[PDB]
């Protein structure tokens, strides 16, 4: 059954809701990015109404096969009428294709839908800047204090520098970046940009790839691994013993391998500053933790959620535990006690 923080009150619709049958009530299902925990469930079986962005739509027709006819892609930006009620797509600075919902509900409120998002400044000045909103349904990921990490711009910087240097330092050495979802891929295009590559990685990774309009992406990515010195491989084979094997069958083109992990929050970012970031090492195998995000700091919800002055928030994240629940009720309150809205 679904849960109600999923659920648009005065509407038809839900919001990431596609794994719990047919749900009662629900004319139109909203698809918010094509990640796994929010798109379970969807199939070429599915016959409702789904609304999302172009690129989710590519994503949802090619490698989830969706038929077509149930596929309603919509344009950022624009005031569109879906079964009678206002909506606006805005960008979530997620992953690609990713995007927030305003829904301005008949009898006057309204209402916006962050889904996974990384708050920035640059949403102060989005459609968001012309009216109230009364209920904010809150990615609350990082929602405390001790969640801090670097921009991305110093991430990608840190991770250009490390590659250049060590494959400069040694013309024989292999970048291996992982992947497991949609999401990052600045990180392996900024790294085969600075090396002169195209990166290489499997049929059904370019797949995904070829479905996200990213401009001039032909001349990028490539499936033969042979011509690229940037290899992506799937997230759990970044390991020494899935590295030893990968550098095997290269055929001793290569004789060191340097990788990264993109991961988000670890606790060795209540310590260490980018700048002095170092890698596990093993013989000629060197692994990365960098923490490139896709979602909020806690300051950066925080600057968010004080320009909004929401009347009500309803997190959709971290909601399985009472502690958890409790700790983001304490710092909703302290938001609003010191903005005073
Ligand atoms: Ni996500």
Redesign the pocket.
Known sequence: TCPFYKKIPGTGFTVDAFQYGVVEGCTAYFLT?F?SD?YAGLSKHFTFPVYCSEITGNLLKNKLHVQEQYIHPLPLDTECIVNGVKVVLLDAN??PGAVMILFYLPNGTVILHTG?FRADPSMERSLLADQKVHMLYLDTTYCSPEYTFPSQQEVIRFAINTAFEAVTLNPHALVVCGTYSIGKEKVFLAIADVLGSKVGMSQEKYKTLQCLNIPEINSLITTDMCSSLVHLLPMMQINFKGLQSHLKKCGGKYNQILAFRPTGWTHSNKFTRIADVIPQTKGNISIYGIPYSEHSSYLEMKRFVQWLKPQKIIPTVNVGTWKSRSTMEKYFREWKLEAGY
């Open positions: 990015h990640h929010h997620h992953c996974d």
